Amino acid sequence: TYHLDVVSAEQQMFSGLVEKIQVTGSEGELGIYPGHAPLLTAIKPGMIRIVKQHGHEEFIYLSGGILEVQPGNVTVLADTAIRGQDLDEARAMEAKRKAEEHISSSHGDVDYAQASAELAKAIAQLRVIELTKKAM
């Protein structure tokens, strides 16, 4: 067996020892057995097959990424969303628009919204510091 790591930028998708895997490489489909000599390649979006030690097969879905194989270790640096060229340019254009047109979107932290509004109302026109004679 060898140790497989599937990690995204955000979180760890899989770990542990494996007997083999089959990946869809950019050039073609692939398959990594233990001791496989060092390799580095991109991978296309699609499933990946793992056989956990003792033959327990399972399928994971990966949106893309990069495969790095060392002799006794392998890691799959996966991505969170489909990464292309024209997909990213839409994001770039939207981010550029939002900066000239001052479209400042709101967050969604409703707990902070409620706490802040109660805290703003409660403290309003308290006039406490005029009432007690603190100097300040």
């Binding site: 409703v110 707990d111 409620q114 109660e118």
Partner: protein
């Protein structure tokens, strides 16, 4: 015995006292409004078999007598600390504080735990109820503040997520 408003007896006494020109005291109640409720509520007592036997001149011997009393008091705007409420709270053996925010919200009877207590306690309680109910009061007195903190907090720790909903069942 049940006194419907000891807070209206004090007003009638204040009137009848001022009309006799007797000097007033705090909040214009007569000098001795405390000795008014004190000497009234100190009649509510449990009296032992020797007293009953002597009083009744030997006709009944095995018994003890009692006269339990539930005075009622009205507080302005929940102010338990006003002059006549803090008097009577200092004479009795406990209080059941009925809270308006629970009553409007539909929790009826609106018994407010924590603020309300019985100072004789379990000595009076029947054995089965003393056993089963022992834990309730503090459980509720804590759930009621956890349900306050639960306004600002979403994503509650599932350890407290159980206490909340259990306290809510029982409430």
């Amino acid at each position: 015995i049940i006194y419907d408003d000891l807070s209206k007896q004090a007003v009638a006494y204040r009137q009848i006292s001022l009309l006799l020109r007797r000097p007033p005291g705090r909040e214009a109640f007569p000098g001795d409004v405390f000795y008014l409720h004190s000497r009234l509520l100190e009649r509510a007592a449990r009296v032992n078999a020797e007293y009953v036997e002597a009083f009744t001149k030997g006709e009944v011997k095995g018994k003890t007598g009692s006269l339990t009393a539930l005075p009622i008091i009205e507080t302005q705007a929940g102010d338990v600390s006003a002059f006549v409420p803090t008097n009577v709270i200092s004479i009795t053996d406990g209080q059941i504080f009925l809270e308006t925010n629970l009553f409007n919200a539909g929790i009826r009877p609106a018994v407010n735990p924590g603020i309300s207590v019985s100072r004789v306690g379990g000595a009076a309680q029947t054995k089965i109820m003393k056993k089963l109910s022992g834990g309730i009061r503090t459980a509720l007195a804590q759930y009621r503040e956890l349900a306050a903190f639960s306004q600002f907090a979403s994503d509650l720790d599932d350890a407290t997520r159980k206490q909340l909903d259990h306290g809510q069942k029982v409430t």
